[PDB]
Amino acid sequence: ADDMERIFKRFDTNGDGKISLSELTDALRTLGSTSADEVQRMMAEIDTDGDGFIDFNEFISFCNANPGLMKDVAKVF
């Protein structure tokens, strides 16, 4: 099982290692999420400097998985 790891490695298929948040924040609701806009407008204030990508540390900074935004999203689809 996995909460965010099931998504991280999923988006981490480019070649470098980071994931385009702009694509993640938009590739969440399409899976069944709900609070996608919560980061869609705060993906550059959570950690990302502005480039539009994240290695891992910056990716987990948003994956609080508190309310169940990530704890119940990697199993949805």
Question: Structure solved using which method?
Answer: NMR
DSSP characters over 26-41: TTTGGGT-STTHHHHT
Which residues define the annotated binding site? 12, 14, 16, 18, 23, 47, 49, 51, 58
Q: What total of structural domains would you count in the chain?
A: 1
Closest CA to 25 of 2, 48, 49: 48
Structural domain range at position 54:
1-77
Q: Who's near 28: CB < 8 A, 6+ residues apart?
A: 36, 73
Domain CATH number, residue 46: 1.10.238.10
Name beta bridge partners: 54: 19
- Identify which of 1, 23, 21 has the alpha carbon closest to the alpha carbon of residue 75: 1
Coil vs helix vs strand at 19: strand
Query: Which positions make up the binding site for Ca(2+)?
Result: 12, 14, 16, 18, 23, 47, 49, 51, 58
